[PDB]
Design a protein around this ligand. Structure first.
Ligand code: HEM
Ligand SMILES: CCCCCCCCCCCC(=O)O
Length: 422
């Protein structure tokens, strides 16, 4: 059983020899050391091998251009068998096409991609906007409140339910299951170290998803209008009508969807407020020119980088950054560093809503695995800020945010916000 990660003070990077820089530490983000640690790696060892880590030996690729190459080169770097830095609880490795190489990756992704196709998103836009306005209206305006459960987690759970047509009153289950899987100490240095609960969740999820498939099939056989959820789409296409007969594909694809959209959406929604707090001239610029919302959504996603990395394994020896990556080595593409690389972005650490190249961010990765839900993610953020401008003249963070323990998700568990209506 992987032991629990206990927080200790992270020293300055200059106190360390290059070979001893270990960025797998899941408290780097919380302690505000990630920026300096990744800068030193970009400047002095952009392709860096760490031989001593709790998750095992690994390479760190930290420059924007080098990450691009690795992410795009599925001929040289495999996404199998996992894309988190460590390993899952033995027996609890779920099959997900995010950790699959072409050509199977392509078959499975194509079988679900229609759920976030633009025509499908347009039909979801009104429900997303309704819920966003209802949630914002319900918020207190005379006192600070925790934005994380009140807004980010609330809207994300509703969205995950809509994607699977999951019972709304059980939506919390999708988040709880996703949080435990992504926060496994063995995989991300997260706080979830009870493996029995992970096995319990796996069975509860297989049963819940199986019940959902059979329930939707029955309702379909009864002539219910086919919805815009993944289940309805899967049951509407010849190749996936029998998907329940293949349980690895079924449970894997559905688990990937909810984990993929769980804390990414949550921390995108919270992170924009943190960026507004650090660069409040950005809020005045936005109020003066709302047209900049779409570009600002890209800049929020660049600055926050809700998912810090994706991991690969070298299919062969590969020369990169003056180093020889050996076949079988684990290679970690640090999006969180790539997006702060001044070789691509001027003033990278600065939140600039009118940033000309904000759309060039690598927060969704690049290559065959580039985030499938990227348009829905941008849609949710665009609606949130449209509805924020309608209601509030100012939003202030009145307390230092509390940040989540993980080397994988970059996020906030507590964000105290004071709203000023207009
Ligand atoms: C800003 C929000 C989001 C972030 C930061 C994010 C992050 C990522 C990243 C980094 C990847 C892999 C990139 C790569 O390896 O090159 C990915 C893939 C994926 N994401 Fe997201 N994502 C977001 C939104 C969403 C949402 C809302 C969903 C669900 C609706 C989703 C579902 C997926 C799926 C299914 C994949 C696998 C695609 C594949 O492997 O072919 N994403 N995401
Ligand atoms: C414990 C092994 C599984 C870890 C969680 C699944 C992998 C992450 C999938 C979501 C990707 C993302 O959110 O960017």
């Amino acid at each position: 059983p992987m032991p629990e990660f206990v927080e200790t003070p992270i020293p300055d990077v200059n106190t360390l020899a290059l070979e001893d820089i270990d960025v797998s530490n899941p408290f780097l983000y919380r302690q505000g050391q990630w920026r300096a640690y990744f800068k030193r790696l970009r400047d002095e060892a952009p392709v860096h091998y760490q031989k001593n880590s709790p998750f095992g030996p690994f390479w760190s690729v930290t420059r924007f251009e080098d990450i691009l190459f690795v992410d795009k080169s599925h001929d040289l770097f495999s996404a199998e068998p996992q894309i988190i830095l460590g390993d899952p609880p033995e027996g609890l490795s779920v099959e997900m096409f995010i950790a699959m190489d072409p050509p199977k990756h392509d078959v499975q992704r194509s079988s679900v991609q229609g759920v976030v196709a633009p025509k499908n998103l347009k039909e979801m836009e009104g429900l997303i906007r309704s819920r966003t306005g209802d949630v914002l209206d319900s918020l207190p305006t005379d006192k600070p409140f925790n934005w994380v459960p009140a807004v980010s987690k609330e809207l994300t759970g509703r969205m995950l339910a809509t994607l699977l047509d999951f019972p709304y009153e059980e939506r919390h289950k999708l988040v709880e299951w996703s949080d435990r899987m992504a926060g496994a100490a063995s995989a991300t240095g997260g706080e979830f170290a009870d493996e029995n609960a992970m096995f319990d969740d796996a069975a509860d999820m297989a049963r819940s998803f199986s019940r959902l498939w059979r329930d939707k099939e029955a309702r379909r056989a009864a002539g219910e209008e086919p919805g815009f959820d993944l289940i309805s789409l899967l049951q509407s296409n010849k190749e996936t009508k029998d998907l329940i007969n293949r349980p690895m594909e079924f449970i894997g694809n559905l688990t990937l969807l909810i984990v993929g959209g769980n804390d990414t959406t949550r921390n995108s929604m919270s992170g924009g407020l943190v960026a507004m707090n650090e660069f409040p001239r950005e809020f005045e610029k936005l109020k003066a020119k709302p047209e900049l919302i779409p570009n600002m959504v890209s800049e929020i996603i660049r600055w926050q980088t809700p998912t810090a990395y994706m991991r690969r394994i070298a299919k062969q020896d590969v020369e990169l950054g003056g180093q020889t990556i050996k076949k079988g080595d684990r290679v970690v593409m640090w999006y969180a560093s790539g997006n702060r690389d001044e070789r691509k972005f001027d003033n990278p650490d600065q939140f600039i809503i009118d940033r000309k190249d904000a759309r060039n961010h690598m927060s969704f990765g690049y290559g065959v695995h580039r985030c499938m839900g990227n348009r829905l993610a941008e849609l949710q953020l665009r609606i949130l800020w449209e509805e924020i401008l309608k209601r509030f003249d100012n939003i202030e963070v009145v307390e230092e945010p509390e940040r989540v323990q993980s080397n994988f998700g970059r996020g906030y568990s507590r964000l105290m916000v004071k709203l000023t209506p207009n």
